[PDB]
Design a protein around this ligand. Structure first.
Ligand SMILES: Nc1nc2c(ncn2[C@@H]2O[C@H](COP(=O)(O)OP(=O)(O)OP(=O)(O)O)[C@@H](O)[C@H]2O)c(=O)[nH]1
Ligand SMILES: Nc1nc2c(ncn2[C@@H]2O[C@H](COP(=O)(O)OP(=O)(O)OP(=O)(O)O)[C@@H](O)[C@H]2O)c(=O)[nH]1
Ligand SMILES: [Mg+2]
Ligand SMILES: [Mg+2]
Ligand SMILES: [Mg+2]
Length: 348
């Protein structure tokens, strides 16, 4: 049935030891930053972001520690201190609590844990005064401070008053109106320069949460499936798009009301081929806006040839996928998927 996709997904998700390591690690990091006295006046919030938070991360090959992105929200005035000087403020904290285990990775700090690799970006709140104070109430809320992932909290709402269900009302509290957060993203260091850029991790999480529910929980699992395909055919595929550029392209192609993984995949693949045919013939790339900062093109760093090589790769995958979804021979159908996904996709 559709159970073959459930076993395959449990095989590509990060393992429970990694899961328990990034939950306690982020919790231990959050308490340390809040209690640390030279940073007891600056740290506003420490929360999990990224594919770990959005349940779009696949387990790495060869037992390498998965990348777990973490945001430290500060109350610093980003107009009076540059990101290097803001990251320099956390150097003593790192030496004391995470000695010989951290490293400055330019835009972010890397913390090597037992099973995971923490990726920390120091961020500041653009707002000020009573407007800043209302945003800090959101970053100190259970909505943001939750260490559970989107697959575990399908009812997740972006709201300072929202509490998670106890599986038995603050849980019924809906997403905060866009006027409170949509145009108020955080700022982080540039990948290369000593200048603040703009990021909106919460908005990306809220779009992913809404898109997941609209696709009957299949959206995050389809992103994991395609990321797995991209890793198992990496020798026939170009180095980009990978990671969030790839995930964003799947959230664009996949349509609302997805009934099954089998029907979800070919649909998003067919739509990727139909939608970008006019852009691929001109040997060009699309310009998709980010769910967080709308004035940002998620594919800004993707080369135009890179995307057209990927478009060619999806066409090769499309032949297998359509055969496997239409094949009614269980010996041929389950074999067909494994040509796309490798051995981790199991038989009936
Ligand atoms: N809008 C936008 N956000 C990005 C982009 N790259 C990274 N991000 C954000 O930064 C977060 C972490 O970056 P990465 O760890 O490099 O991307 P990732 O997909 O989470 O990495 P893995 O899942 O571990 O493979 C992502 O979840 C995004 O929210 C980008 O190109 N555009
Ligand atoms: N929270 C978070 N956001 C990220 C991360 N990495 C990238 N982003 C967001 O994704 C956008 C694209 O990231 P990059 O590809 O590194 O772009 P950049 O070189 O840093 O800056 P520009 O190219 O000038 O926009 C950034 O503007 C960030 O807002 C991350 O690790 N954490
Ligand atoms: Mg990541
Ligand atoms: Mg990262
Ligand atoms: Mg840059």
């Amino acid at each position: 049935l559709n159970s073959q996709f459930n076993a395959f997904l449990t095989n590509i998700r990060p393992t429970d030891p990694q899961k328990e390591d990034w939950k306690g690690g982020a919790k231990t990091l959050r308490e340390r930053l809040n209690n640390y006295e030279p940073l007891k006046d600056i740290v506003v919030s420490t929360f999990l972001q990224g594919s770990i938070r959005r349940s779009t991360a696949i387990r790495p090959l060869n037992g390498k520690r998965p990348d777990v992105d973490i945001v430290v929200v500060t109350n610093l005035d980003h107009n009076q201190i540059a990101p290097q000087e803001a990251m320099d403020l956390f150097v003593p904290f790192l030496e004391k609590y995470y000695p010989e285990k951290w490293v400055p990775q330019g835009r972010s700090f890397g913390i090597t844990l037992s099973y995971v690799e923490l990726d920390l970006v120091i961020t500041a709140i653009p707002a000020s005064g009573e407007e800043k104070n209302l945003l800090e109430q959101l970053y100190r809320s259970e909505s943001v401070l939750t260490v559970n992932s989107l697959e575990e909290q399908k009812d997740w709402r972006l709201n300072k008053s929202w509490k998670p269900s106890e599986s038995g009302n603050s849980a019924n509290i809906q997403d905060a109106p866009l006027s409170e957060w949509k145009a108020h993203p955080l700022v982080l260091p540039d990948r290369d320069e000593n200048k603040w850029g703009r990021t909106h991790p919460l908005a990306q999480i809220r779009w992913t949460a809404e898109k997941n529910r609209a696709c009957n929980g299949h959206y995050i699992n389809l992103v994991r499936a395609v990321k797995w395909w991209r890793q198992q055919n990496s020798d026939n595929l170009p180095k980009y798009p990978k990671g969030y550029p790839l995930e964003h392209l799947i959230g664009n192609a996949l349509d609302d009301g997805t009934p099954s993984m089998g029907k979800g995949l070919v649909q998003l693949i067919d739509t990727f081929l139909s939608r970008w045919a006019y852009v691929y013939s001109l040997r060009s790339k699309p310009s998709l806006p980010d769910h967080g900062v709308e004035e940002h093109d998620v594919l800004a760093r993707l080369s135009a040839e890179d995307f057209c090589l990927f478009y060619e790769g999806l066409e090769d995958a499309a032949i297998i996928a359509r055969s496997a979804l239409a094949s009614q021979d269980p010996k041929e159908s389950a074999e067909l998927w494994r040509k796309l996904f490798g051995t981790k996709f199991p038989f009936p």
